[PDB]
């Protein structure tokens, strides 16, 4: 850190005051630059502060007109420590009218706090920033109402991209600079330019790797150009970032002790620290300025001006850090749903007494008041209007006040007030009444009996299901009888059921009348319920719940049972889906389907059957030469099947079943049937040998040719082609009926001369090969 340390600044109106940061290297406080209305971009263009590397508290920018980016104002800012926050935020950019991009392209760590960038109407380059590499808790950020959320910011990124919430997008600060991502090994202590890890005692950037004296921002504590995990014995920790010698702390104490014009701290020494005040239970010495244990009880009383303090952020809580007795009243009014329980415990944990009252109003995020770890006594010397010492007006998420099993909290004066606390169960309030000792007086507004706990399960007692019965669509339930101390207070039971695909479960409310009363409780009849319309072999989540009158005299709390997962009984499955069969070969077929739409239980196997089918009878009787006429298998874990060893061009029938169980009385689906014809073979319909002929004196020629032995299904007709010597060619159709009638084909009226004839066969699939040429002669008259 080659520069002076500055005590933290506020800069308003004029940019002339911006020059006091000229030599600064660390700001020991907050940096606020705000309310510069007459500024223009021509003024900020030549203004740079490269020496600033660290801000201890926070950085706030508010209505600085004419500022377009911070890439020039703070070129080398590295770490914002965040010891003190601005409404639990360590960087606020609010209402910056002319800002375009942030540009803090060297910012590496914000050690404590969140970031709030809001109402910047021309600001882009926000979605291109991976905040998870800067803030450890990004869920508490607030980046809204900017140009990003309005139009389509043109983030023309120049830069290791990164995945956020399941989306892979690039990272960059400006159009010429982008985020400096470091290897995961170099975790939280930065990396070199080439990726080598720096020393574990360094923070952010570093010059050379693994060197404790060559890093810019320094983790833990800094001393004489070196980082130390803890300061050496001669030095003491100061401001949680640097080690100072005794002369420094003593000089600060002496400077503060001479005057009280505005207010400072009598800096004091403790166990290797230079703290503003001696902690609780210690007193300041005379000369060496060292906290020593007291001779008796020494609480750290924190006197609140105006008589009351409202806690709405981490800053307000930090204003009470270390105090043991609050001489005033506390209002807890935390909004926003940020769950500040950790910081509240850290800062308000040591509070032991509250002289006035305590009020928890509109604390939406608050879950429980356990962060008051040591609150022992609300004295109530100043009461809220209505003589209340404890107040709870609207707590959406308050589900607990204290753990009364091991916590003790008494109230000297005043009543209690509880209203509109949807998740605060009345049993907790009544336990608070018993513990706090308010018995002896009365609380007029003790509890709004119906506005407290009506969104939370306040049942405490346990109830057991007597037995459970299952069926394929119906389920019957019975459970033990519940009996409140007052019989008339019972109002029945409520049963809920919902589909439960998981084991870690919308619900359908079922109202049940109270069980029938009997003179002998041993003769009392067990209430029960039955259900209809349940999917077979399907799991559901069930439970029961009682209901009693909220009689404040007896304050009965009813009862509840457990949650159980019950599966229905399996039944027959539905038809197999998409049953198709394709003959992949002349002798092979493939059957394909999909599992049934309703398995109705675990699917075990499939039943497949196939067999041969005879050809149609009409094919053996119809004439086509006229115009205008022409063994089983069980399949397991598979949705396809192949069958081989078949006949070509033969009608077949295939039957497919779906069975959800094999051994215990087989349960299969409805029968699906498909019929198909296999592919034919070319050689099946081919003719063999020539045509035998006979010649008669009346110019009639008889032709006889061999019928194919194994045709593709059936031979339907034959084609006879004959041509005279030196003449054209003629064709003739011979049907199967004609072929059987004439035992071939007879040609009549042929002209005299020599003829050559060839004959081809036709089957159901196609035409066969031609016959060998045959020569015959016709007599001339």
């Amino acid at each position: 850190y080659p520069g002076e340390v500055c005590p933290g600044m506020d800069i308003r109106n004029n940019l002339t005051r911006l020059h006091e940061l000229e030599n600064c290297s660390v700001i020991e406080g907050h940096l606020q630059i705000l309310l510069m209305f007459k500024t223009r971009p021509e003024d900020f263009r030549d203004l740079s502060f490269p020496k600033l590397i660290m801000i201890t508290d926070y950085l706030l920018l508010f209505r600085v007109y004419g500022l377009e980016s911070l890439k020039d104002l703070f070129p080398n800012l590295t770490v914002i420590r965040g010891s003190r926050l601005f409404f639990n935020y360590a960087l606020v950019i609010f209402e910056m009218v002319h800002l375009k991009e942030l540009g803090l392209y060297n910012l590496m760590n914000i050690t404590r706090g969140s970031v709030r960038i809001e109402k910047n109407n021309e600001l882009c380059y926000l979605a291109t920033i991976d905040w998870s590499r800067i803030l450890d808790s990004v869920e508490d950020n607030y980046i809204v109402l900017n140009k990003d959320d309005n139009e389509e910011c043109g983030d023309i990124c120049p830069c290791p991209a990164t995945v956020i919430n399941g989306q892979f997008v690039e990272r960059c600060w400006t159009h010429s600079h982008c985020q400096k991502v470091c290897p995961t090994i170099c975790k939280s202590h930065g990396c070199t330019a080439e990726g080598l890890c720096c020393h574990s005692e360094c923070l952010g950037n570093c010059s050379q790797p693994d060197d404790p004296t060559k890093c810019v921002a320094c983790r833990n504590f800094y001393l004489d150009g070196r980082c130390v995990e803890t300061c050496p014995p001669p030095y003491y920790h100061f401001q949680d970032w640097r080690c100072v010698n005794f002369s420094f702390c003593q000089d600060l104490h002496h400077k503060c002790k001479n005057s009280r014009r505005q207010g400072c701290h009598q800096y004091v020494i403790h166990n290797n620290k230079c703290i503003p005040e001696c902690p609780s239970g210690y007193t300041m010495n005379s000369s060496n300025l060292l906290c020593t244990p007291c001779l008796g009880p020494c609480p750290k009383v924190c006197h609140l001006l105006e008589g009351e303090k409202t806690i709405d952020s981490v800053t307000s809580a930090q204003e009470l850090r270390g105090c043991t007795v609050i001489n005033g009243s506390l209002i807890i009014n935390i909004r926003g749903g940020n769950n500040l329980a950790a910081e509240l415990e850290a800062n308000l944990g040591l509070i032991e007494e509250i002289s006035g009252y305590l009020k928890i109003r509109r604390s939406y995020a608050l879950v429980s008041l356990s962060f008051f770890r040591k609150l022992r006594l609300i004295r109530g010397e100043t009461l809220e209007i209505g003589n209340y010492s404890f107040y709870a007006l609207d707590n959406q998420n308050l589900r607990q006040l204290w753990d009364w099993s091991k916590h003790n909290l008494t109230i000297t004066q005043g009543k209690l007030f509880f209203h509109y606390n949807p998740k605060l169960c009345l049993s907790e309030i009544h336990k608070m009444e018993e513990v706090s000792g308010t018995k002896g007086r009365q609380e007029r507004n003790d509890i709004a009996l119906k506005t407290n706990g009506d969104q939370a399960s306040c049942e405490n007692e346990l109830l057991k299901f007597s037995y459970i019965r299952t069926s394929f669509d119906k389920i019957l339930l019975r459970w033990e009888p519940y009996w409140p101390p007052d019989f008339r207070d019972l109002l029945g039971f409520m049963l809920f059921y919902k589909e439960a695909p998981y084991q870690n479960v919308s619900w359908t409310v079922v109202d049940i009348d109270p069980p029938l009363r009997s003179n002998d409780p041993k003769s009392q009849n067990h209430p029960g319920w039955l259900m209809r319309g349940l999917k077979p072999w399907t799991q559901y989540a069930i439970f029961v719940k009682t209901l009693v009158t909220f009689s404040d005299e007896r304050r009965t709390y009813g009862a509840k049972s457990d949650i159980i997962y019950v599966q229905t009984d399996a039944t027959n499955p539905s038809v197999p889906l998409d049953p198709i069969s394709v003959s992949n070969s002349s002798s092979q077929i493939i059957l394909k389907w999909k599992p049934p739409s309703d398995p109705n239980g675990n699917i075990t196997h499939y039943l497949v059957f196939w067999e041969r089918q005879a050809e149609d009878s009409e094919l053996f009787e119809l004439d086509y030469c006229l115009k205008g006429l022409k063994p089983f298998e069980k399949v397991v874990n598979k949705e396809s099947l192949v069958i081989s060893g078949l006949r070509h061009f033969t009608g077949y029938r295939i039957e497919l079943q779906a069975c959800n169980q094999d051994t215990p009385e087989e349960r299969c689906s409805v029968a699906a049937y498909v019929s198909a014809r296999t592919m034919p073979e070319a050689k099946a319909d081919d003719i063999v040998g020539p045509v035998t002929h006979e010649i008669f004196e009346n110019n009639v020629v008889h032709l006889m040719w061999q019928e194919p032995k194994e045709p593709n299904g059936l031979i339907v007709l034959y084609e006879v082609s004959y041509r005279r010597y030196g003449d054209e060619e003629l064709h003739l159709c011979v049907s199967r009926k004609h072929f059987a009638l004439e035992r071939g084909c007879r040609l009549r009226g042929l002209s005299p001369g020599n003829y050559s004839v060839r004959i081809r066969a036709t089957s159901l699939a196609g035409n066969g090969s031609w016959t060998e040429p045959t020569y015959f002669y016709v007599t001339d008259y």
Binding site: R469, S471, K474, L476, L530
Partner: peptide, 9 residues
């Protein structure tokens, strides 16, 4: 209600 009566019995 045949199954309902069976459940009853």
């Amino acid at each position: 209600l045949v199954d309902a009566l069976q459940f009853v019995c």
